[PDB]
Structure 1
Amino acid sequence: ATRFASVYAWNRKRISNCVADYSVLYNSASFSTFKCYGVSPTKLNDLCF
């Protein structure tokens, strides 16, 4: 956004009632490490969290 919070006091946000996608993780910024634990990571558009 412009600024997050530090590591001793991490920042929290609530997310609901919206449609998401990971295919748009390729345009606004290039991510260096993108790993998902415990679920098939390219199936995010296939479930309901």
Structure 2
Amino acid sequence: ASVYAWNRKRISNCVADYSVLYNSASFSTFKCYGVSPTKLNDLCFTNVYA
């Protein structure tokens, strides 16, 4: 989306793999706050919003 009206997807009822995301080193940054990108795989959520 254009940032004036950014898109948002709710993610729910599923099994994630943040290691696969963190391994996509084409990502120029993966800066995190309140969590470390490794530990995401041990940890889980009511919802994730992208």
Root-mean-square deviation (CA), in Å?
2.0
- Which TM-score applies when normalising by structure 2? 0.70
Shift of residue 26, structure 1, vs aligned partner: 6.0
Normalized per residue, the structure richer in helix is 2
The answer to whether the 8 A contact 2:18-2:41 is kept is: yes
- Which TM-score applies when normalising by structure 1? 0.71
1:1-49 deviations in whole A, cap 9, x for unaligned? xxxx100100011100111112212676711101111112210011111
Partner Cα separation in structure 1 for residue 38 and residue 6 of structure 2: 27
Runs of at least 5 residues in structure 1 that lack an aligned partner in the other structure:
none
| Count of matched residue pairs | 45
Partner Cα separation in structure 2 for residue 47 and residue 26 of structure 1: 15
Normalized per residue, the structure richer in strand is 2
